[PDB]
């Protein structure tokens, strides 16, 4: 049994989003599509489920404040709107079915991130972390590329167009207020750098932001 | 709101082994009706949860034979004979016997091997982003384990955390450790305004914390 979920919703606290989940798979199961919240990293908050066939309709009682359950049960699409949006709220959402005595999920749909930022598409600034004065372990000279003020993610940061893999550490992009950073490192032989090119690469693709930046001495 | 309490947070194994995990409730998930309402939900790294064991013992159809559950009441375990790589992720308990459903908070499942001390690298702000206004220090701090540091800036002997910014490395499947980055963010006059930079990783590796210092 498949459904089908929204694409990721980026929007400025104080919105109305609304997400669909379309299931088409469980017909005749007169099932229920259910709401699941994933938080940042892990934790799981249920919001409630709603029967297609039917109209049956809960919700946890602390959900029952910012969303609200929909069904145009002929489209096979039942809308969740999460209504006046904070910071807090940029999370996974998760579609689930359930059908009889288990009273558990057995079928998630694919999840969608509604990410909530008052900036709109700025483009990253990206600066070369050449080992300025860490000096040596001998073999070991780390160097590192800084990813910083990007809006939305992702980032694409390969080192030396692809070949350069081994010994790469590319962290999490976290947001600075509202803001994404980012940064990587790449890790050689004490011969590569400085003889050799190790351009970090970045492009944040949905600003149209291609930029190599070397990383030399 | 039926408070689930799994424990513990990370599980560290050896391919083979087995991971037994413990599931705990604020009362009885026995409905009255005679059913119990325990779940269990894998959630592999960039995937959705699956359903794994309804109802306590009950696996979903599709679950093999290595997963089973038992327990009663308000103590509940999921044991995993043999831990295939396969298994790795996120399991976590939920409660379907009252309103609202709940979930308990997760336990991941990190390969074992030895130690390893955080190689830190601590890196002086780019001459682009001086010309820009800013000033970022910036501390690397690879292939260690556990996943457990404690990472300090000090600009002058004296500590900081306002404007930190942290970010962190899942297990690497090549030789399964952690890498850390830690991000202080001043303005061009805070860095002018001062000297020497220091990053140190408290961690079991040293009793003596790991240091790095630069001074501008
Ligand atoms: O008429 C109605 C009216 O009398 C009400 C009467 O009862 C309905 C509402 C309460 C229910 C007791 C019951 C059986 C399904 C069950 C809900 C309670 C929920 O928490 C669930 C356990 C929830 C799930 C949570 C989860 O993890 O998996 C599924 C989705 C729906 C659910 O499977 C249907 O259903 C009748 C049809």
């Known amino acids: 049994v498949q459904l089908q979920q929204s694409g990721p919703e980026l929007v400025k606290p104080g919105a109305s989003v609304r997400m669909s989940c379309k299931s088409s798979g469980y017909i005749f199961t007169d099932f229920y599509m259910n709401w699941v919240r994933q938080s940042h990293g892990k934790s799981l908050d249920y919001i409630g489920y709603?029967?297609?066939?039917?109209?049956?309709?809960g919700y946890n009682q602390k959900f029952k404040g910012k969303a609200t359950l929909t069904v145009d049960k002929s489209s096979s699409t039942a809308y969740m709107e999460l209504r006046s949006l904070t910071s807090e709220d940029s999370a996974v959402y998760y579609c689930?079915?359930?059908?009889?005595?288990?009273?558990?999920?057995?079928?998630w749909g694919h999840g969608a991130s509604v990410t909530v930022s008052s900036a709109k598409t700025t483009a990253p600034s990206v600066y070369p972390l050449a080992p300025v004065c860490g000096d040596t372990t001998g073999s070991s000279v780390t160097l590192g590329c800084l990813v910083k003020g990007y809006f939305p993610e992702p980032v694409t940061l390969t080192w030396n167009s692809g070949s350069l893999s081994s010994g790469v550490h590319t962290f999490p992009a976290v947001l600075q207020s509202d803001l994404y950073t980012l940064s990587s490192s790449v890790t050689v032989t004490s011969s590569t750098w400085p003889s050799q090119s190790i351009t970090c690469n970045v492009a944040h693709p949905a600003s149209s932001t291609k930029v190599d930046k070397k990383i030399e001495p | 709101d039926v408070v689930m309490t799994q424990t513990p947070l990370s599980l560290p194994v050896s391919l083979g082994d087995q991971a037994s995990i413990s599931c705990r409730s604020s009362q009885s998930l026995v409905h009255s009706n005679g059913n119990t309402y325990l779940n269990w939900y894998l959630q592999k790294a960039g995937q959705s949860p699956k359903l794994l064991i309804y109802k306590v013992s009950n696996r979903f159809s599709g679950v093999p034979d290595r997963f089973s559950g038992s327990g009663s009441g308000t103590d509940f375990t999921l044991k995993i004979s043999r831990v295939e790589a396969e298994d790795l992720g996120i399991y976590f308990c939920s409660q379907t016997t009252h309103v609202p459903p709940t979930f308990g908070g997760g336990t991941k499942l990190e390969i074992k091997r030895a130690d390893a001390a955080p190689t830190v690298s601590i890196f002086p702000p780019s001459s682009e982003q001086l010309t820009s206004g800013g000033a970022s220090v910036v501390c690397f701090l690879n292939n260690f384990y556990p996943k457990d540091i404690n990472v300090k800036w000090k600009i002058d002997g004296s500590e900081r955390q306002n404007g930190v910014l942290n970010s962190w490395t899942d297990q690497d499947s090549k030789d399964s450790t952690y890498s850390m980055s830690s991000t202080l963010t001043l303005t061009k006059d805070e860095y002018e305004r001062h000297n020497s930079y220091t990053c140190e990783a408290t961690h079991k590796t040293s009793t003596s914390p790991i240091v790095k210092s630069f001074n501008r």
């Open positions: 709603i029967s297609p066939y039917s109209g049956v309709t």
């Open positions: 689930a079915g359930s059908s009889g005595n288990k009273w558990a999920m057995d079928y």
